[PDB]
Amino acid sequence: ALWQFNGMIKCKIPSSEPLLDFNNYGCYCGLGGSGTPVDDLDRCCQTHDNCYKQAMKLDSCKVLVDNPYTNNYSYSCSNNEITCSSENNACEAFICNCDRNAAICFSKVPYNKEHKNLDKKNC
Amino acid sequence: ALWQFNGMIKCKIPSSEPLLDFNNYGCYCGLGGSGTPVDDLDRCCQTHDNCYKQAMKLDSCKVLVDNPYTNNYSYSCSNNEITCSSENNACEAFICNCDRNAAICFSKVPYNKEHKNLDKKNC
Numbered sequence A, B: 001a002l003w004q005f006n007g008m009i010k011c012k013i014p015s016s017e018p019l020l021d022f023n024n025y026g027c028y029c030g031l032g033g034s035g036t037p038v039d040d041l042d043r044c045c046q047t048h049d050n051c052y053k054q055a056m057k058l059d060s061c062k063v064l065v066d067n068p069y070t071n072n073y074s075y076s077c078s079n080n081e082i083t084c085s086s087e088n089n090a091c092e093a094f095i096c097n098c099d100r101n102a103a104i105c106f107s108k109v110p111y112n113k114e115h116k117n118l119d120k121k122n123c
């Protein structure tokens, strides 16, 4: 769920408020996404959106009322690394992996502030 | 919270249903506890009860409506080891440590089935 993804990104980027910094960035970072990623961060968000789309196709996820934004799963941050828990059921474990991969991708690419609150004419 | 402690013990003892196996055992394992531990497992439960008592004394815990049984915290099981998350606030982190120590103590001591549903005359 979104709260865990928030905690994951802070795990890798301790100076960020993820819901502020990485919301509404580029064509993909944020609810929705369309068109060509504007940079590498946006491309991280595109992969993550595609991972969420693949999760919602799985039979395990289809059974659950919860969607990837509200489906709580368990993970730990320890020494700035993320580990998804073996206690997670198949759906929540796939989502945890999506989010972990996105948090790592976020920490390894440039942040271009001029893509912040990008006017969606560009997408 | 109790759900996480359940998952923790299964992390170390994958064949157990912890809420069945380690509830109502000896003088301490279970809600309450008094008197002298009947064996080492019961002693694990006494330490854990004392750790919960110490947690409820902390200013961080005193602020929270939640008690150690309902206070959800985050942790992961991975390769049968437990890691409490850096995302945990001070109260939830102390509780996570109590529970982790108890799960480990449980996996390292004998289980004496004859102490199961011990008649509390003995305590």
Ligand SMILES: [Ca+2]
Pocket (backbone or CB within 6 Å): A028, A029, A030, A031, A032, A033, A045, A049
């Ligand atoms: Ca998106």
Ligand SMILES: [Ca+2]
Pocket (backbone or CB within 6 Å): B028, B029, B030, B031, B032, B033, B045, B049
């Ligand atoms: Ca007890």
